[PDB]
Amino acid sequence: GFKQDIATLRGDLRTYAQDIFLAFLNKYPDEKRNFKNYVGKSDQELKSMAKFGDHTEKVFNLMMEVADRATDCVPLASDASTLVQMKQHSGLTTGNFEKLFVALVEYMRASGQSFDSQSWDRFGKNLVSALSSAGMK
Amino acid sequence: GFKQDIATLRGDLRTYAQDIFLAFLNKYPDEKRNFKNYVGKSDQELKSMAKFGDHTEKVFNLMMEVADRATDCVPLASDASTLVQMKQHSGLTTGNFEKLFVALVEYMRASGQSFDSQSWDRFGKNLVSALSSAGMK
Numbered sequence: 001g002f003k004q005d006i007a008t009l010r011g012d013l014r015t016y017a018q019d020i021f022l023a024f025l026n027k028y029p030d031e032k033r034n035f036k037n038y039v040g041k042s043d044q045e046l047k048s049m050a051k052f053g054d055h056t057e058k059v060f061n062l063m064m065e066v067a068d069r070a071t072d073c074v075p076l077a078s079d080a081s082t083l084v085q086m087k088q089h090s091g092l093t094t095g096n097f098e099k100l101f102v103a104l105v106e107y108m109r110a111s112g113q114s115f116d117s118q119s120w121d122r123f124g125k126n127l128v129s130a131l132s133s134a135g136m137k
Numbered sequence: 138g139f140k141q142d143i144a145t146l147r148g149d150l151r152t153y154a155q156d157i158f159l160a161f162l163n164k165y166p167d168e169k170r171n172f173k174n175y176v177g178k179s180d181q182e183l184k185s186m187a188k189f190g191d192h193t194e195k196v197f198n199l200m201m202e203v204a205d206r207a208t209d210c211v212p213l214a215s216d217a218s219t220l221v222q223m224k225q226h227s228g229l230t231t232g233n234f235e236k237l238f239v240a241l242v243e244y245m246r247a248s249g250q251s252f253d254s255q256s257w258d259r260f261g262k263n264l265v266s267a268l269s270s271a272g273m274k
């Protein structure tokens with residue numbers, strides 16, 4: 001289930017994080033509007049760019065914590081508020097997170113592994129709802 | 138407290154893992170007996186090797202899983218058994234773990250961040266006791 005998937009991802013978190021975020025950027029190339037420095041770079045070039053490696057690592061370290069603190073894939077409202085109030089996220093909207101989780105679910109379904117993709121689909125929808133309630137446009 | 142410290146560490150897991158492991162290796166030079174491939178390299182030379190960060194991150198992920206599953210800083214006997222039975226740990230005794238947590242507590246106390254160093258010292262002691270109970274010499 002969802003809780004075991006958190007353990008699976010955490011057990012190889014750097015590789016999963018970079019692969020899922022790359023899947024996001026390659027499924028939705030226009031999302032580089034928020035990452036101008038990512039333009040004109042292959043996956044392997046991005047993986048050697050410090051700001052990509054560091055942001056991606058932060059994304060998934062904190063996402064696994066938010067998932068871990070969730071009940072039945074519903075995040076804490078306080079976790080959603082913290083995400084909304086992050087300064088570097090000022091230009092984001094719920095659509096950015098929606099797309100991230102569509103790519104993550106697609107990645108899990110395509111993997112060879114026993115991920116509970118339905119739970120991650122719910123988690124992403126419930127996070128988006130919570131971000132909206134917390135003030136994200 | 139302890140639970141928040143797990144969240145702090147997980148929030149920047151690779152960085153904290155490398156810095157705490159380096160603190161251990163430098164406090165106890167003989168402990169590189171179990172790390173032949175790290176001999177003859179400075180802290181920054183080690184951090185530059187992707188395998189060092191990869192290994193340290195995976196170690197500390199399991200450490201955080203054991204810490205999060207603990208009750209009042211007492212680890213589960215089943216988690217201690219896992220650590221005893223790991224093939225990678227066949228050469229080890231509890232003193233190896235005692236020294237790791239002495240260095241970890243020293244790192245936390247010098248950090249100037251608000252770690253609950255007392256709880257981590259207790260956790261390390263209770264982990265050592267639990268490793269002994271699970272069959273480590």
Ligand code: HEM
Pocket residue numbers: 168171172191192193195196197199200201203220225226229233234237
């Ligand atoms: C609670 C404490 C510890 C945890 C959670 C832990 C966990 C782990 C994990 C997950 C690995 C596999 C690493 C990987 O896949 O890259 C590993 C390997 C290893 N650990 Fe531990 N460990 C702990 C303490 C120690 C201590 C104190 C020592 C020695 C002083 C030690 C020595 C080793 C060695 C020699 C390996 C083999 C290195 C390799 O993977 O090639 N561990 N440990």
Ligand SMILES: COc1ccc(Br)cc1O
Pocket residue numbers: 154155157158161192193194196197237
């Ligand atoms: C002493 O063994 C270890 C302790 C902490 C990390 Br991080 C990695 C290790 O290999």
